[PDB]
Ligand SMILES: CC1=C(O)\C(=C/N=C(\C=C/CP(=O)(O)O)C(=O)O)C(COP(=O)(O)O)=CN1
């Protein structure tokens with residue numbers, strides 16, 4: 022049938038009133054794709070929730086449609102967020118759609134090319150700092166406390182209310198809750214939202230409770246180290262975050278679900294990044310592939326038992342970050358003369 | 372609802388046997404988004420079919436899932452295509468998914484950066500030539516005449532079989548066929564595919580027949596100019612194509628539909644490109660926005676009368692081409708000290 026966006030489709034789970042604007046970019050309802058080759062190789066039943074087909078190319082659209090609709094309902098005209106790039110892209114698109122001004126603070130030289138192009142195109146006022154995301158978040162929260170500008174980072178609870186619908190959809194698309202929900206962790210709002218979603222669906226519809234398995238990049242694994250990281254690092258700039266704002270909710274999700282927050286190296290991330298594209302035709306940005314890298318690590322160790330039904334969240338479209346793709350990949354265009362014989366000869370001799 | 376890809380959902384309209392592999396990346400079923408502000412400013416009811424949310428970010432996935440499934444059914448292990456970038460990305464993804472080799476021939480320096488990243492990541496054998504798309508297609512077609520390599524460019528009929536499904540969806544999502552289907556024209560397969568779709572749905576389901584309104588970029592407007600353009604040009608490199616392989620089908624489609632194939636300038640394309648992102652929050656690549664530029668042109672001229680119900684096809688995701696976005700945009704980011712006081716006063720100023 023039809024799909025009219027999250028606010029309409031999940032209205033009973035959401036803080037929607039008759040005065041809530043009907044804001045939508047048709048976000049949500051993203052594919053849950055079975056990966057049969059990787060399932061065979063791993064000895065599990067692996068599906069990927071491909072959030073890169075959301076309107077701005079990441080799961081952030083789920084929370085942002087809710088946050089911006091409520092911000093407009095509650096009488097604001099300007100929104101602001103700090104971002105590694107996907108939240109600012111979402112905020113900018115929904116602000117333009119909603120006729121609100123948008124201001125974003127980003128870490129200079131540390132957001133992907135595609136995310137920058139979106140923020141420029143959607144019409145945000147873009148402020149860059151030489152600090153990291155964590156610096157930007159501190160500044161943004163201070164400013165929205167000291168101005169009438171509405172904060173639309175994940176600490177805004179409407180963001181997590183929108184993002185929990187991804188757990189609803191996974192249950193509906195799989196026909197049941199999975200054994201394991203594998204997910205990247207940056208600012209930790211998303212793993213918190215999925216867990217909140219699984220609990221609500223458990224209570225209302227009787228679905229089971231997955232083990233929540235979150236994965237930070239080793240260079241930014243503040244939760245795994247149990248310490249704030251003052252200079253987080255990782256090539257997966259989406260999750261280059263050393264003081265997650267939803268730290269306590271995420272640890273609670275892991276504990277209540279009998280799950281775990283783990284870490285993956287950049288090399289593990291980049292391997293999973295190439296793996297799913299080469300073997301399954303699925304292209305997600307590096308930070309997203311922490312979930313797949315996490316599945317490979319824990320299938321190897323037995324922490325994900327063979328035969329498990331596993332959903333890995335692919336949080337962002339691979340088109341967000343074309344530089345990493347070309348920088349790391351061994352595949353390069355070979356330049357040939359515009360001559361059928363040379364090309365055919367190359368085709369056969371290679 | 373639930374969605375398992377085009378082969379499953381549109382089986383009855385597709386040349387699908389019990390031998391056809393169940394190939395899917397869940398392509399299709401893309402949003403039809405009403406644009407209420409642009410509608411108001413133009414005096415029409417305008418919707419956009421946002422094909423950028425297909426698995427590889429363009430409508431090519433519709434044709435490619437059918438062409439690659441049929442290629443595997445018929446015994447092939449390799450596919451090949453020429454491309455300005457989106458057909459090669461689709462070909463590469465579906466080949467990977469179907470366990471096939473993929474060879475793509477692209478024009479050096481004339482495919483968008485996101486499309487190159489896709490071809491590399493999906494694992495295609497990428498051959499770049501000093502020539503243009505038309506040169507690459509000539510070579511690819513010649514090669515596939517004599518070698519056991521399946522041609523998956525749009526001269527493969529299975530590409531149009533899959534691509535026609537977009538018109539089916541438009542009718543179901545709108546509740547009726549629109550008065551006008553506005554669409555970019557590069558190699559002309561897609562406008563032919565929509566019209567084929569609209570004729571089929573008319574015969575089977577009684578829907579009406581839109582006017583097919585195609586738009587080439589002016590520097591590549593071979594059909595408008597009635598000439599093979601040896602040196603096609605346009606910033607919209609997706610549609611930088613001077614000898615459209617489906618020329619005759621596309622002229623027939625505009626003729627049978629009482630439509631027209633028109634051209635829009637690069638400045639018109641770029642205006643539409645910025646307009647929809649700024650005003651409606653919808654971001655498509657420059658070639659896609661030829662359809663919006665054409666709607667603006669023909670509303671202004673009266674060729675799309677006020678009150679028309681219009682669906683414009685946004686063929687590719689804006690993330691395909693990050694360079695044009697940052698190059699055209701006078702909106703440069705500003706670097707400020709990492710100080711909340713210093714940035715607060717700058718926001719207030
Ligand atoms: C593609 C992708 C991201 O963009 C991202 C965070 N992106 C951010 C992070 C923080 C901003 P917030 O969304 O927390 O307001 C962004 O700015 O785009 C994460 C991590 O998800 P969390 O654990 O942070 O929910 C995974 N994957």
Ligand SMILES: CC1=C(O)\C(=C/N=C(\C=C/CP(=O)(O)O)C(=O)O)C(COP(=O)(O)O)=CN1
Pocket residue numbers: 429431452453454455456457458459523524525526555556557558559560561562609610656658659686687
């Ligand atoms: C975004 C986009 C394209 O990539 C594209 C053609 N893209 C091509 C062009 C030709 C290859 P073909 O699909 O004809 O085999 C590509 O290689 O990606 C067109 C024009 O559609 P047609 O008139 O060609 O149906 C509009 N929009």
